[PDB]
Design a binder for this molecule. Sequence first.
Ligand SMILES: Nc1nc2c(ncn2[C@@H]2O[C@H](COP(=O)(O)OP(=O)(O)OP(=O)(O)O)[C@@H](O)[C@H]2O)c(=O)[nH]1
Ligand SMILES: [Mg+2]
Lengths: 165, 141
Amino acid sequence: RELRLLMLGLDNAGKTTILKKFNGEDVDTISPTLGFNIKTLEHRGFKLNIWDVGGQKSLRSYWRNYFESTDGLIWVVDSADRQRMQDCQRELQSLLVEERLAGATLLIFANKQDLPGALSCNAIQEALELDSIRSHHWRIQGCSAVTGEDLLPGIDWLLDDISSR
Amino acid sequence: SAKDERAREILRGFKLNWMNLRDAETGKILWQGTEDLSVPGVEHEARVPKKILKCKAVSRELNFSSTEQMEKFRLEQKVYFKGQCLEEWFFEFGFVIPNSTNTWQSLIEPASVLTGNVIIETKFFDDDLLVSTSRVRLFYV
Ligand SMILES: Nc1nc2c(ncn2[C@@H]2O[C@H](COP(=O)(O)OP(=O)(O)OP(=O)(O)O)[C@@H](O)[C@H]2O)c(=O)[nH]1
Ligand SMILES: [Mg+2]
């Protein structure tokens, strides 16, 4: 069975840079996603459909039109954006009561770790109240879309988790 | 009828901006298409480097705009050599946001013959209404 992955977060989080770097494509000319960027490929024998959806205020309200039949959700965070960290928390918890996302596996990318003022995973773990999450399986992973650091470790786990259920 | 008019602003507002071809192993573009792929009276064409016939990794990307919202968007792609079929792809996007620009990529895994005889036809549907039809002729090198 093909797997459907759904990638969300606040605008400027790193979603599109992560999706591109992960496919071995350049990331030097990325611009705000004004819709959705879908990528169909094969990884470790899995047939995937990865949906990266724009995170600007205007686009966000359409997020739920893509909830259906989602196997894993990737929530992407700008580790160095302490300013919207609570709006990030709100959006996520709100995603955790969605009925069309129930039993989906949650993966959290603490992105932009290559940045000077980046909060650890613990800080981000704490900031988003992940410990209180029992509705889904989850896992946080810090990384860097630009350097390509620790992207596979997250996707590989996500892929194995969904497959086990 | 209001349905006709609606089914008319949906057509008017949709535009296929570009298509491209990459070597999936490297992530390098082999060919990106300018080029009023939507315009009529023109047989759209791709002058691709022959190496493309050597990779096992080819990825094709599309980029499209829609002024209008649509609830059951889907596409059908077929690559033909004459009457023979090389590849047939399908994809259900479902919902399409109003005033939005979207991308779709799939990873596809001798010459004097192929050049000028390879066609890629992408058909775009909202539910079952045809919204757009593209055709691109392949010229190897
Ligand atoms: N230093 C650093 N900058 C990053 C990293 N990832 C993305 N960026 C920068 O963050 C910016 C926004 O990156 P995008 O990939 O467009 O973000 P996005 O989540 O797709 O944004 P939307 O399309 O608005 O949803 C860019 O200026 C990238 O250069 C990262 O790991 N480190
Ligand atoms: Mg983006």
